């Protein structure tokens, strides 16, 4: 305990281990990153699918809002404007209509 | 009309969700491009790292044998 407490080639050995650990850590990062990249790409398709359906619904909402708003505008609607409106509303949007 | 006010409320809730998902798509698409660029850097450096290592293996044996 007392004696052990008081107690060129190293750089060649340590450098080849150092460089190979650089290679392996970079290699494992590459493998894991590729898998993660494919996971994010697959997740992106679910985002596109979910947002894509919502974009279609958003257009529907804009149509009823804009058409009734234009109808609310201060001009006398014609009779045909009324009939076509309720035909469109009832036929295209029966659930929202009721 | 009051229905139209309900509709504007529905538009507002919808617009916030839509802007979130649109920016989320951009952030996700950006992370994928960033990762592919990172992959390309590591993949491009993999021969260089392999080249250095092969030289280092030749250097390791040569320098040891010369000193021996």
Curated annotation (Swiss-Prot), chain A:
* Top-rank taxon: Eukaryota
* Compartments where found: Nucleus
Q: What is the tissue localization of expression for this protein?
A: Detected in muscle cells from body, pharynx and vulva, in neurons from head and tail, in pharyngeal gland and in tail hypodermal cells.
What is its biological role?
May be involved in pre-mRNA splicing. Required for embryonic development and survival.
Q: Which family does it belong to?
A: Belongs to the TFP11/STIP family.
Assembly and binders:
Identified in the spliceosome C complex. Can assemble into large rod-like polymers.
Stated name of the protein: Septin and tuftelin-interacting protein 1 homolog
Where does this protein come from, organism-wise?
A: Caenorhabditis elegans
UniProt lineage: Eukaryota, Metazoa, Ecdysozoa, Nematoda, Chromadorea
Report the portion of the entire protein shown.
298 to 415 of 830
């Amino acid at each position: 305990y007392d004696s052990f407490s008081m107690k060129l080639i190293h750089n060649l050995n340590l450098l080849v281990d150092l460089t190979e650990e650089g290679i392996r850590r970079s290699n494992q990062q590459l493998i894991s990153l590729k898998d993660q990249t494919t996971a994010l790409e697959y997740d992106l398709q679910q985002v596109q699918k979910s947002l894509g359906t919502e974009e279609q619904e958003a257009q529907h909402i804009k149509d009823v809002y804009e058409l009734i708003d234009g109808f609310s505008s201060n001009r006398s609607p014609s009779m045909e404007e009324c009939q076509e409106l309720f035909r469109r509303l009832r036929s295209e949007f029966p659930h929202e209509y009721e | 009309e009051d229905i139209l006010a309900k509709l504007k409320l529905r538009i507002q809730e919808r617009d916030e969700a839509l802007n979130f998902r649109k920016e989320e798509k951009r952030k996700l698409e950006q992370n994928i491009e960033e990762n592919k660029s990172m992959i390309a850097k590591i993949e491009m450096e993999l021969p260089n790292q392999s080249t250095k290592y092969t030289m280092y293996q030749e250097l390791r044996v040569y320098s040891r044998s010369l000193l021996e």
